[PDB]
Amino acid sequence: WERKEAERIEQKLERSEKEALESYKKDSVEISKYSQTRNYFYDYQIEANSREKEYKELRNAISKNKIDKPMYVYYFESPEKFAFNKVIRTENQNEISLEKFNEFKETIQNKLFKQDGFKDISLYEPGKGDEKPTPLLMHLKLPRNTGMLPYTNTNNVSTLIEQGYSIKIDKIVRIVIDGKHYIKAEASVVSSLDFKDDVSKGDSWGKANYNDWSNKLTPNELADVNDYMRGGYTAINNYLISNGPVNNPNPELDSKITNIENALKREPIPTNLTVYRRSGPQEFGLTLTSPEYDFNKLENIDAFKSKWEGQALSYPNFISTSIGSVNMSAFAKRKIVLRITIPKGSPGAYLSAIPGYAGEYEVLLNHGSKFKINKIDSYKDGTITKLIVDATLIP
Amino acid sequence: SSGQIVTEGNSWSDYISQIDSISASIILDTENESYERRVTAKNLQDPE
Amino acid sequence: SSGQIVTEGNSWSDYISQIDSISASIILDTENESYERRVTAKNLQDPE
Amino acid sequence: EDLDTDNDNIPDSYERNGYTIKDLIAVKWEDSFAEQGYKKYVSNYLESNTAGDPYTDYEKASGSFDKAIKTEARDPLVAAYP
Amino acid sequence: WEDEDLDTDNDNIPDSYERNGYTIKDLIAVKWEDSFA
Amino acid sequence: EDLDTDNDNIPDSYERNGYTIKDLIAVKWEDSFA
Ligand SMILES: [Ca+2]
Ligand SMILES: [Ca+2]
Ligand SMILES: [Ca+2]
Ligand SMILES: [Ca+2]
Which residues are listed for Ca(2+) 2 binding in this entry (chain E) (predicted)? Predict the structure, then answer.
């Protein structure tokens, strides 16, 4: 039924892929956790890791096989993955209160949450002997051309996938399974283009999509924006931060700002894209010596999430972002990394498309942009723990 | 799971007794065709 | 994996020799019923 | 309380003192329920299948099993047995 | 509770819709109205 | 648009109004394709 289907797949796998799958079957948790946060290190750090080979073999084995139609998958998810820190119900309780249901409902009202790791799923709804570790059950519809690896584990045909998308929850209801209340969510995948570590692919895509962008620029404003981004971007941003047009109005810098905005507005981004930026404490209203900047202790992260997660954002100046997610020596101290999803059609441009040292895979966004923070999560970077913020740009 | 009609492993005998237990039987005879039906009935002794 | 009892594939012949090798056999005869038992015995030549 | 030692989704104190199923959830028994037609159940709180039959205490009490089984085989102390 | 977001038997029809009446259009259960007939 | 109610890789409006497959992708029908 599925035993010969699992066989026909494993037969055509490599011996290295087979031993990688076995090592996953033995120590799945650590491998999944590593795959979640693997792309936020240095270029050479991710190369010398003693677990990168396993990740590469597993991702190749998964992506070898793809599906041709959308289909639904079923799994249990921890409710804190959707930025709900409270408990829906304890593991021994049997009933879910209406207040908890409502709190979970307005927690996930209009948001997108990103999933970036290996996962073990099922193609059939949970039954009787199936493990039910969380009070949240997910009905997710996968898109076409997504990879699944059906492997037998102690007879049970299990399925393994890798997540590279962001999901949104449409409707939630309360159901009963074996005398226990569960929250059942219907979710859908929102496709996006994400170059995590392979900056080569992102650079090639940006070149192909924005090397002709300069041609559409009128030459005077082209040289004007070019001279800005070489020498005067710091001055323009500093003038914008101090609310210069309102406090000390002057047309000399307002002309530069208008030219930059128009040039960025000329050609928008054609596809949903994700960019990574390392943010400083002054952006969040903190100082380098503030005690809360130390994320080793739990209370600092808890307070930061309580005061920032789910709220809005506003950057009067321009935002400098890079396609890649690897750590750079220019912002090594920055403990806060910002993950931004760019909706299709939003203003922006690939600065590094033009020849010369335009930056490090630089992508610029229009000033005055607003952001919404969906979820905030933490990962350990050597002897210190850095903090990851997931956000969506709104028009 | 792939969206294909599977027939092996599905047996009406697993459901015959359960359908007969909770239903009433109605037959219409006419002259050229006969029709037999089962319609679900309510158990008034069970509040649930 | 569920609460169901399974007997297929569970064979006593896999344990007959192992039980006989490490046990002593005791029988009580009585008058109207017989009882046969196996009790584990210690091997003094093996320090482990 | 909320202890469930045998993991049959009926708390130990409900099994020990008496319970009934409504809306597919076990609730504490009250003497006013007998007028509405409910039945009071007790069972083994250390055993998921009190009667030893292939169905757990919750399945029997709740009627979440074959509907061809007789109604007296619904309390945990009477076995479903042909 | 007090909203039509309950599905006790988990069969894609809300409890009150089954209790009172429903019909299917575009593969979604909708609340019944007399004009549908 | 891009609604696919039955999940068969063809949008609902294309199925209603007519479509053809070229390069393994369903496209809107145009009379010059005949
Ligand atoms: Ca119990
Ligand atoms: Ca019990
Ligand atoms: Ca229902
Ligand atoms: Ca369709």
Answer: 9, 11, 18
B25, HSE (Cβ side, Cα atoms, 13 Å): 7
**How many angstroms away from the CA of D54 is the closest CA of chain C?**
6
CB A173 within 8 A of CB E6: yes
CA–CA distance, A324 with B29 (Å, rounded to integer)? 76
Q: Which of A348, A284, A293 is nearest to A322 (CA)?
A: A348
Angle at F15 between CA F9 and CA F17, to 5 degrees: 145
* Residue type for position D23: D
Counting as contact any 3 or more CB pairs under 8 A, the partners of F are: A
The owner of tokens 């797949």 is A9
d(CA A260, CA A323): 20
The residue numbers preceding gaps of C to N over 2.5 A in chain B are: none
Nearest Cα to A307, choosing from A299, A316, A315, A317? A299
What is the structure's resolution, reported in angstroms to one decimal? 2.8
Q: Is A180 helix (H, G, I), strand (E, B) or coil?
A: strand
User: Which residues are CB-contacts of A71 (< 8 A; sequence separation ≥ 6)?
Assistant: A123, A141, A142, B1, F7
Residues comprising chain E, all counted: 37
Tell me the CA end-to-end span of chain A in Å, nearest whole number. 49
Q: Are A63 and A120 in contact (CB under 8 A)?
A: no
In C, which residues are within 8 Å of D54 by CB distance?
4-5
**A141/F4 CB distance under 8 A:** no
Give the residue on E whose Cα is nearest the Cα of A100: E1
**Does residue F20 contact residue F29 with C-beta atoms inside 8 Å?**
yes
Asked if chain A contacts chain D via 3 or more Cβ pairs within 8 Å, the reply is: yes
**Number of Cβ atoms within 10 Å of the Cβ of A13:** 18
For residue A58, the tally of other CB atoms under 10 A from its CB is 22
Length of chain F: 34
Output the CA torsion sign for A32, A33, A36, A41: negative
Report the 10 Å Cβ neighbour count for D25. 17
Q: A241 by DSSP, 3-state: which? A: helix
Paired tokens of A46: 């991710």
Determined by: cryo-EM
**Closest chain A residue by Cα to residue B8:** A1
A179 touches chain C (CB under 8 A): no
Give C1's contacts in chain A (Cβ within 8 Å): 129
Which residues fall within 8 angstroms of residue A358, CB to CB, at 6 or more apart?
A: A229, A351, A352
Return the residue in A90, A91, A92 with the most chain D beta carbons within 10 A, the one to mutate for interface testing.
Answer: A92
A131, HSE (Cβ side, Cα atoms, 13 Å) = 7
Q: Which ligand is nearest to the CA of D50?
A: 2
Q: List chains touching B (3+ CB pairs under 8 A).
A: A, D
